[PDB]
């Protein structure tokens, strides 16, 4: 049951992080307006967040956690300590080099990133200052996520999940209180993320002390563990760049599209990355350490059981979510984005991109389940091979769909790209005789889909009772929003309960 408890804890903590995130820019825009200073900090803060995809989130984790599990299971806790100290030191050196690079080349990075900031002299001078202040955040979040990764390997998931929203509270305090202490006050926000990064790191040392994994970052290039981490980081960086290329060409097609389409894709992606980030990302952080421990220990039957449990729970929590987002594509857009600058036209286009993205919503989450399967096997080359294959085929459906579907085609093609990426993941797993699903899958699907028709029948029935959503103000429109969905999911879980489905069937130990 602790596997469900950990998954619920991470998903709930991420839920807290996102709602704190929405409050973050709401107050920031309220107190700092929406001038050239506000988006200057946004650019200076998003840049370390993309570098997080390399050193903290999307490249370092799958290249380090599987090695950590093998070291812990076989060699012992002493060899694990010397290994983690060496890799942490090498990681600190890598982050220090790039951080120092940004220190003496902050103006160069600004013009490289945003050409629209160099022409504005007063914004260029401002953004260079903030970028200098918030650059060490990538250093702090690199160790913060490094400690979060090892804690996850030791079955501590609540503590790392608190770190993201913890930075939100630190930033909320700096903006609310230390506004007049800086001239201009925007530098307070720049210091806020830096202080948040330190506060994130210092948070987990008391927990790291409990397991005795605290280590000074010693340096040894010749050490085998560090060399292996870098060796596997090779394909990991290749996968990150491959996904980056796919994102780049998606932007190329979007730019060629009709004017104003980029905003619709941005908002649809916001409403699409919200559930996949809460569900799929959280599922990755729990499965990856657990699968790696089972594979390293030689418990292949537990590796298959964990893979099956992650797969069935993914279907259980993603299929209703995808259909619900598709059904409420209209209500969601008109209750979150149809305010002043939006009309009925813009909300309609966002709803069409929402249903197209929600088709692949199941694909995005299940990819976050299948990808740790090969990441667990210390075979990162295969996911990249699927990634490039998906990349090339994504473009040929992109140029096929832009014709008759325009922005809806781009969103739908991304959705099918993730879904077929997952089927490629499934095919490779079965072809190499690795994952053997437990019997009873067919009954699981048929009982799941009929619950989805319960979701739709209740939701469209409640929608037609619910009068026009444009009526009312902010609090009234939002209040009716979760009100319908909580009754819908309650009906969904009631349908699951009367269908012979119980929580104990999804309870996993260790």
């Amino acid at each position: 049951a602790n596997l469900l408890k950990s998954l619920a804890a991470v998903s709930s903590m991420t839920m807290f992080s996102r709602v704190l995130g929405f409050a973050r820019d709401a107050i920031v825009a309220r107190i700092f307006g929406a001038g050239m200073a506000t988006d200057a900090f946004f650019v200076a803060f998003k840049l370390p967040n993309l570098l997080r995809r390399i050193f903290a989130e999307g490249a370092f984790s799958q290249a380090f956690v599987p090695i950590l599990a093998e070291y812990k299971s076989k060699q012992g806790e002493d060899a694990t300590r010397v290994f983690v100290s060496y890799v942490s030191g090498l990681l600190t050196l890598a982050l220090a080099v790039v951080t120092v690079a940004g220190m003496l080349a902050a103006p160069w990075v600004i013009m490289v990133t945003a050409p629209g900031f160099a022409d504005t002299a007063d914004k260029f001078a401002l953004t260079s200052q903030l970028l200098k202040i918030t650059f060490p955040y990538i250093l702090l979040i690199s160790l913060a996520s490094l400690v979060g990764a090892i804690l996850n390997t030791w079955n501590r998931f609540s503590i790392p999940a608190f770190a993201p929203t913890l930075l939100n509270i630190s930033m909320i305090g700096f903006a609310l209180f230390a506004a007049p202490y800086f001239n201009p006050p925007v530098l307070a926000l720049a210091w806020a993320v830096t202080v948040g990064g330190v506060l994130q790191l210092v948070y987990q040392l008391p927990h790291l002390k409990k397991i005795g994994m605290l280590v000074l970052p010693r340096i040894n290039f010749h050490d085998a563990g560090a060399m292996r981490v870098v060796k596997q980081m090779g394909p990991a960086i290749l996968g990150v760049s491959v996904s980056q290329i796919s994102l780049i060409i998606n932007t190329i097609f979007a730019s060629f599209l009709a004017s104003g389409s980029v905003s619709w894709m941005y908002y649809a992606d916001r409403l699409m990355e919200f559930p996949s980030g809460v569900l799929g990302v959280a599922l990755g952080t729990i499965l990856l350490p657990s699968l790696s421990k089972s594979f390293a220990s030689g418990n292949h039957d537990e590796y298959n059981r964990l893979m099956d449990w992650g797969l069935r729970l993914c279907f259980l929590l993603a299929l209703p979510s995808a259909v619900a987002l598709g059904i409420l594509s209209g209500p969601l857009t008109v209750s979150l984005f149809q305010y002043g600058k939006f009309t009925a036209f813009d909300a309609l286009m966002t709803q069409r991109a929402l249903i197209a993205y929600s088709v692949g919503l199941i694909g995005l989450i299940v990819v976050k389940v299948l990808a740790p399967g090969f990441y667990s096997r210390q075979d990162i080359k295969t996911p990249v091979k699927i990634a490039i294959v998906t990349l090339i085929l994504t473009q040929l459906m992109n140029l096929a769909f832009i014709g008759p579907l325009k922005h809806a085609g781009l969103s739908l093609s991304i959705g099918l790209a993730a879904c077929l990426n997952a089927s490629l993941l499934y095919w490779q797993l079965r072809k190499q005789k690795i994952f053997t699903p437990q019997p009873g899958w067919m009954a699981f699907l048929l009982r799941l889909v009929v619950a989805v028709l319960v979701m739709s029948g209740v939701l469209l029935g409640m929608l037609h009772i619910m009068p026009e959503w444009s009526l009312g103000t902010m609090p009234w429109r939002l209040l009716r929003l979760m009100a319908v969905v909580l009754a819908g999911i309650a009906a969904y879980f009631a349908a699951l309960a009367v269908l012979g489905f119980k929580v104990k069937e999804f309870a996993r130990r260790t």
Binding site: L50, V109, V112, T113, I237, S241, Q244, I248, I252, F256
Partner: protein, 38 residues
């Protein structure tokens, strides 16, 4: 040795993702509007 170029290439991709997309968008823009009627 080859690892460094891979790290630098992907760092460039993340840091300059908007600018490379913008750079090629009007670079191949004359190429694509001439492709429309062909």
């Amino acid at each position: 040795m080859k690892y460094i170029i891979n790290l630098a290439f992907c760092v460039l991709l993340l840091v300059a993702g908007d600018s490379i997309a913008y750079r090629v968008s009007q670079y191949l823009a004359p190429l694509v509007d001439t492709f429309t009627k062909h």
